Design a protein around this ligand. Sequence first.
Ligand SMILES: Nc1ncnc2c1ncn2[C@@H]1O[C@H](COP(=O)(O)OP(=O)(O)OP(=O)(O)O)[C@@H](O)[C@H]1O
Ligand SMILES: [Mg+2]
Lengths: 193, 52, 125, 172, 29, 210, 52
Amino acid sequence: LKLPTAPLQLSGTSAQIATLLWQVAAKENQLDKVQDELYQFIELFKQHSELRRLATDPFVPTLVRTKIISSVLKDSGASEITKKLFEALADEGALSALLEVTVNYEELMLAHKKEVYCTVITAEPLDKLERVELTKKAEKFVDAGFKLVMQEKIDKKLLGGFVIEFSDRRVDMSTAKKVEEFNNFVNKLVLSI
Amino acid sequence: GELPSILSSLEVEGHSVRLVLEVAQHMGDNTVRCIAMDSTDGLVRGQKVVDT
Amino acid sequence: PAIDAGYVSQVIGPVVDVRFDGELPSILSSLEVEGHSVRLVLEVAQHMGDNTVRCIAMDSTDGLVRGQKVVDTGSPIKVPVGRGTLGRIMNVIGEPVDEQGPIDAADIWSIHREAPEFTEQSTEQ
Amino acid sequence: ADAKALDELRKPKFSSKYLIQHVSQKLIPAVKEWEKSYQPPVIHLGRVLSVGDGIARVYGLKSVQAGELVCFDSGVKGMALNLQADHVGVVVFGNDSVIHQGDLVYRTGQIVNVPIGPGTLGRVTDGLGQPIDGKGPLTNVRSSLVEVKAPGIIARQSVREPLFTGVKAVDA
Amino acid sequence: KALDELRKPKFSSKYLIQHVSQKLIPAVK
Amino acid sequence: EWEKSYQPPVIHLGRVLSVGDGIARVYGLKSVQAGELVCFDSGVKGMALNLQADHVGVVVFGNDSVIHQGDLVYRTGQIVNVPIGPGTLGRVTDGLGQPIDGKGPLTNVRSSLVEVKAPGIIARQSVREPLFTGVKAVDALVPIGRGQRELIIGDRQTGKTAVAIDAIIHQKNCNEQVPKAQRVYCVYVAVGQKRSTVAQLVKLFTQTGA
Amino acid sequence: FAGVGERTREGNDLYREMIESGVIKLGAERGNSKCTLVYGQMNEPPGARARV
Ligand SMILES: Nc1ncnc2c1ncn2[C@@H]1O[C@H](COP(=O)(O)OP(=O)(O)OP(=O)(O)O)[C@@H](O)[C@H]1O
Ligand SMILES: [Mg+2]
C-alpha cells in the first residue's frame, strides 16, 4: 500500500491518530470536509451531556458506547472516514481524545495551507514600503512557498529595525540588538589585543 | 455482565483439565484478575468462563 | 476574585494539588486555603504542567474537598522576626503558640532565602 | 498539543452544521433504546471503579473530604484516603471481597470517627468502635474523630502524679 | 467551561493506533 | 568585516511545561542540541539533557523557584563551556567558570567546552617524570608521576584533603626553584562542600602563597 | 531554639525551665528575654516539620 506524506512530524498516540486522519483525508480530497465536522463534534459535546457521557463515564458498556455512535452517524455528512473513526474511537473509549486529535489536525492543516502566523514588532508604525520590503525580508526565515500574516506591534525600545516572532522562533533584526552585539564584539576584541 | 465477587471461583469452558480460576481483584473496565488452580497452557483469549 | 484564587484539584495526604485558571504562583509561595477548620497554609513545591501547582501543607489536610478555594498570597511563608520575637514560641508559619498575644514584629521575613555568598564568609577559629 | 491552542477550540469555528442537527434529533431515541443498560449516573455518591488488595478506587464522590469515612452499599466502611482528579482512593475497613465494581459508595459526611464516652466503658469494640462483645450497641456515647492533633506545648504541664503499676520491679 | 473533562484523554491501550489504522485505511474507497 | 557579514542569528524559543526540583520540562526548542546551554527569561541558565519527542528535560543552573509554567526558554546554540586560560589562576570560580571571589571578571581567558574527548593512544607518551607530593609516606611508597590518576580514597575524617592540600602547597615550593617549563599549576575542585570549608582553603592558599 | 520533630513534652519542659531561669521573661519584661523558641514537634504533619 501507500499513503501521502504528512506535512510536519509530531507527537504520539493522539497526534498520530491525527496524522493518519490527515493521511486518509488527503487521499479522499475531503481535507477541509473532515476538519469542520471535527469542529461539529466538539460543539456536539458542548451541548449534549449524554454524548460526553460516552467519553468520560467509565461505567458505560463498551457495546452501548459504540452502538449510540453508529446509530447517530447514518449517511448525513458521514464522509466514511469521520464515521469509521468514531466507531474506532468508541471501540476503545477514546472519544475523550477528540479535543486532542483536532488540535493536532489543525496544525497539520495550516502546514498544508502553507501559512505561518507571524508577528512583527517595529519601533514606529510602518509605511507601505517598509511593510512590503519587510515582508520580502521575512520570507527568508520560512524556507518554502510560505505566506506570512502579521500582527504588527510597536516597541520604542527597539531603535529601528524589527523583531520577528514566529511563536516558535524569534529573529531580532532590530538595531538595539545590533548596537549591543556590536558593543559586545568591540569590547571583546580590544581585550584580545 | 456483572463481575464475580473477590475470592469467587471461576470455571473455564473447554480445557484438557478442569481449570478453576479464583478471583483475586477487580481491575476495572469489567475485568477481574484471577489466579489459576492448574496450568494455563492452551488457554485462549476469549474462552468462555463461567462464574460459580 | 477568580484569577489569583485557585481550587484544590487533588489531596494526597500532605500533598495538595491546586488548579489555577490563570496566573500560577511562584514556587515556594504560600497559599491559604479558605473554608478549613484551622489555618491551612500550602507552600508551592512544583508546577505540575496543566495550570496545576503541587503544594505541601503546613497543617493536616483532613477535611479538604476537591473544589475548595485556595487564595494565593504572592509571597513565601513569612514569619515575624525582630527582638519582639524573643521570649515567644512560634510555630512553623509564625503564629504564637504560647497564648501571650500577638508577636510584635520588627519585620516579617520570608523563610526562604539564599546562603550568604563566598565573599561574605567569615574564616576565624 | 498546546493549552492556549486548545482553549481557542472552545469557541465555535465550524459555520456549517449539517451534522449537529442530524444527530441532535437522533441522539435521544438512541439513548432510550439503550436505557436499561445504563447504570444511573453518579456525582455526589460514588461508584467503585476497581477494588483489590483492600483498596477501592471510587468514581464520583465529588464532595468527600480527605480522610472521610465513606460507606459501601455492602455496609462495610471505608476511608477516603487520596482524593484524585478522577477517582477517590478508599481503604476498606474490613474484607474487600464484599465490594464489587459498580457498587454504590455512600458518603457519611464525617471524618473517620469512633464513639467515645462513658458508655464505651466495659465494652469490647473492634478497631472502628463497633462492639463485638455481643451485648448490644454502644449507648451513652458520642462520636469523635480518631485523628485529632495532640495538645501543644502550652496545653501541657510536667508529670507530678505517680500512677502505680503494681509491679515491684517497675514501680521501684 | 464544560469541556475540561475532555481536556485530558486516557487510554486503555498503548496500541490505540493499531485499531484506528485497521478502521480508517479500509475506509478510504 | 563583522558588520560586512552580519547575519541576524535566529533564536529558537521554548515554553516551560512543568518546573520543579530543578528540572524544567520545555516544549519546543526543536533544534536544541544534547548538552546545549539554554537560557530562561528569568535569567537563570540551563542545560538540555533529555531530548524527547514532546519535551526537553532541562536541568537548571540555579534556583528553579524563579521559573514558572509558560516562561520562555531561549537556546544559546552552544554546548556548555567555561573560561580557560592563565587568567583563572588565583581566582575562585563557581561550578562553571564564573568567579565568586569578588575580584571582577575573568581577564585574559578563553572559552572551551567542558566535555572534550580524552587524548588517545597516539597522543600519549609514557609517564616518566615525578610529581612530588611532599608527603613522604606518599613519595616513598606510593610514588606519583606526571600524567597519572591517583585516587585518594578513605573513610570520613582521615587525611584525604590534607594529602591534596599538601600536594598543592608543595608545588608552590617547587615552582620557585625549577625553570619555567616544569612548573605545576594546580586546580582544586571542591564539589559539594561548605562555602566555609573552601573559604578556609583560599585563606590557606593565600597565606602560603600557593 | 528550633525544635524540629521532637517531643512536645521536651518543648514544654524547655519552656518552663527557661522561664524559671529568667532566660524567658513573661509579660511586660519580655524584651529582656534571651531566647526565642520555634517548634515543629513530632505531632505536626510532614509539611510543618520540613519547614520549621
Ligand atoms: N597529617 C596530619 N597530621 C595531623 N593532623 C591531620 C593530618 N591530616 C589531617 N589531620 C587532621 O584531621 C582532620 C581531617 O583532615 P581532612 O580535612 O583531610 O579530612 P577529610 O578526609 O577531608 O574529611 P572530610 O571529608 O570529612 O572533610 C583535620 O581536622 C586535620 O586537622
Ligand atoms: Mg576534605
